[PDB]
Amino acid sequence: GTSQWLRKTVDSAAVILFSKTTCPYCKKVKDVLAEAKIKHATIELDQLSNGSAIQKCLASFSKIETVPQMFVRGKFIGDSQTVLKYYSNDELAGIVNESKYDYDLIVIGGGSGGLAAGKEAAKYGAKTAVLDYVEPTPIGTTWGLGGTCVNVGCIPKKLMHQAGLLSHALEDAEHFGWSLDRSKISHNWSTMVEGVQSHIGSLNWGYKVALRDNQVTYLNAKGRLISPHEVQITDKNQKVSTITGNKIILATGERPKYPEIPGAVEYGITSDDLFSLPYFPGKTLVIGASYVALECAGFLASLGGDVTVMVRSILLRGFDQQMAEKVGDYMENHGVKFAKLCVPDIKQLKVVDTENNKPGLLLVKGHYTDGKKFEEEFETVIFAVGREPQLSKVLCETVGVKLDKNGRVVCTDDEQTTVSNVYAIGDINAGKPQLTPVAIQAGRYLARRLFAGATELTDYSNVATTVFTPLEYGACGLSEEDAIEKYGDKDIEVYHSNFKPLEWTVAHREDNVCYMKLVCRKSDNMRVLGLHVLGPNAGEITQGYAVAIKMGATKADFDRTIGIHPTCSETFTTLHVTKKSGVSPIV
């Protein structure tokens, strides 16, 4: 138990010192290591409940039971006198740097999870390399270090959402007494894209500075695992070479899919292209119905565009469908058009005017599920029909890393693959929520287990979400239909209410469009299984409740907690109308 933890900790830590807080010889060694700029993990035995047992077990590697003890890459180096001997004879630097491999850790992929992993490992003395490369889109779009969220994901899309929200702030200002006239105000796409891209640029640079200041080697190159410890790299000049590493973290993410139809790749674009597009898209068709499709359609319409969404079957498959229909109804009432139960079968009418900074012109032909036809012209067509990894680019099949039927990596609950020294984090880890804070937590927690003797695992259950559509939708836990399927309708009670933000009263906005509900389990003390809210600032509302749901909140916990007034969130503390009762939820 303790013995197996200690053996695992010693074998994989790069440089680790076993210590006690009260020990003067330990402080002498800490100071030497600090002077020579040798980074290392430290385990203070007096601060652990079984530190006495650990102390005795150390003798199985060192033949001594005393403290301090210093190890490098699985080898006992010495006690106080011996470490200082090596320091005085200028032998220490060579001892702590000798390794069977070029790196203690190679991270393939410089995005949300990979950068978090690599930085955290280097803190504990692991010699670390992070590899990142951005394969260009079909039209040639590329970007800098930081991954999908930073460059073509959460960051630009929420900034563009904020630009859309400010349109309603302009309308509301007149009712609150400000003298502007919203009717005579227009939006400039390229001005906003320039501001968004300058912020993304500051993030690209910040990550390069962070890696430098943690002594992490950054290679802007494509990585390919050719055996358990060997990574083949290809640089911007297509120069090929090989580097070796003890532990390997795969963190290469996904890219957008295109449907297999004529004209899609040639004449459409994806979210990869939209966030740096040099011209306003114009009249736009969005194909798909995921959160990416609806978020992009939403801000495009708020910025004055003529927007249509083509929906194969339902909106937001896998989310609570009552909430998904309320989201879509709001968008349709506020200027988004929908072509429902429809799929595309794309012709070019005009080439993109790269001179005068203007889109082209396209003819889209499709059909509905009953057989009727769709035919209409658009200036821009955006495909948002899912994302996929392409691990054949990354991972030679002879290495032995097992994939599932979707091409994602099959992992243990500590992110280990079928190859003992290789791990996977983020969007390519099969079965896990595909979110940036999940990738960051998995990467940091893994680095600590590998190089600092930590034990804590990442918890992937009940991870909260928010969809940043024009009216936002936050959620934590089960949808209502999944709860009913798992426990039966008679064991589920749902409390719900409409509400109206105080900010919407003077502005003459809608009375009964915002909505929230708690999905509860009767036979388990009215345990809250899922929380759902449609309204402004839905992510800020939802976050804090995710802590309560993690700790097992019941309806009675929500009832005994007092509201903050006036807020939207306080409506969760006084819910009382049940769905079974038939009483209206309106306000």
Question: Which residues are catalytically annotated?
Answer: 565
Which entry of ligand Q4L, ligand FAD, its own copies, none binds 220, CB below 5 to 8 A by partner kind?
ligand Q4L
Cα–Cα distance measured from residue 583 to residue 355, given in angstroms and rounded to the nearest whole number: 61
Cα–Cα distance measured from residue 405 to residue 402, given in angstroms and rounded to the nearest whole number: 10
Residue whose CB is nearest to ligand FAD in the complex, by number: 111
Q: Restricting to residues 215-274, name those near ligand FAD by CB under 6 A.
A: 222-223, 251-253, 271
Cα–Cα distance measured from residue 460 to residue 467, given in angstroms and rounded to the nearest whole number: 19
Q: Cβ distance 231 to 131 under 8 Å?
A: yes
Cα–Cα distance measured from residue 107 to residue 129, given in angstroms and rounded to the nearest whole number: 6
Question: Applying CB under 6 A, which of residues 123, 157, 161, 517 lies at the interface with ligand FAD?
Answer: 157
Q: Cβ distance 494 to 583 under 8 Å?
A: no
Q: Cβ distance 290 to 467 under 8 Å?
A: no
Q: What CA–CA distances, in Å, run from 546 to 432, 477, 531, 576?
A: 18, 9, 9, 21
Nearer to ligand FAD, 122 or 483 (CB): 122
Nearer to ligand FAD, 51 or 386 (CB): 386
Which positions make up the binding site for Mg(2+)? 482, 508
Question: Applying CB under 6 A, which of residues 17, 33, 58, 435 lies at the interface with ligand FAD?
Answer: 435
> Which residues fall within 8 angstroms of residue 563, CB to CB, at 6 or more apart?
569, 570, 571, 573, 574
Which entry of ligand FAD, its own copies, ligand Q4L, none binds 89, CB below 5 to 8 A by partner kind?
none
Which entry of ligand Q4L, ligand FAD, its own copies, none binds 292, CB below 5 to 8 A by partner kind?
ligand FAD
Question: Among 228, 251, 249, 247, which residue's Cα sits nearest to residue 104?
Answer: 247
Contact residues: ligand Q4L, CB under 6 A: 133, 165-166, 168-169, 172, 220-222, 234-236, 238, 470-471, 536
CA 91, 92, 95, 97 torsion-angle sign: negative
CA 143, 145, 147, 148 torsion-angle sign: negative
Question: Applying CB under 6 A, which of residues 436, 458, 469, 497 lies at the interface with ligand FAD?
Answer: 436
Question: Applying CB under 6 A, which of residues 67, 292, 342, 475 lies at the interface with ligand FAD?
Answer: 292
As measured in angstroms, the least distance from the Cβ of 545 to its own copies is 4
């969005």: which residue's tokens? 286
Strand 514-521 with 527-534, pairing: antiparallel
Which positions make up the binding site for glutathione? 20, 55, 67, 80-81, 222, 225, 396
Nearer to ligand Q4L, 49 or 238 (CB): 238
Which entry of its own copies, ligand Q4L, ligand FAD, none binds 470, CB below 5 to 8 A by partner kind?
ligand Q4L
Return phi, psi of residue 312, to 5°.
-65, -50
Strand 15-19 with 41-44, pairing: parallel
Which positions make up the binding site? 20, 55, 67, 80-81, 112-114, 132-133, 148-149, 154, 157-158, 222-223, 225, 252, 255, 288-295, 312-313, 317, 386, 390, 396, 427, 434, 436, 482, 508, 559, 561, 565, 573
Longest dimension (CA), the chain: 86
Cα–Cα distance measured from residue 353 to residue 129, given in angstroms and rounded to the nearest whole number: 42
Nearer to its own copies, 436 or 497 (CB): 436
Which entry of ligand FAD, its own copies, ligand Q4L, none binds 195, CB below 5 to 8 A by partner kind?
its own copies
161 sits near ligand FAD (criterion: CB under 6 A): no
Nearer to ligand Q4L, 79 or 540 (CB): 540
Distance between the two ends of the chain, CA-based, in angstroms?
58
DSSP-assigned states of every residue in 529-584: EEEEEESTTHHHHHHHHHHHHHTT-BHHHHHHSPPPSS-SGGGGGS---BSTT---
Which positions make up the binding site for FAD? 112-114, 132-133, 148-149, 154, 157-158, 222-223, 252, 255, 291, 390, 427, 434, 436, 565
Nearer to ligand Q4L, 196 or 361 (CB): 196
Residues found near ligand FAD in the complex (CB under 6 A): 108-114, 131-134, 147-149, 153-154, 157, 222-223, 251-253, 271, 292, 393-394, 426-427, 434-437, 439, 565
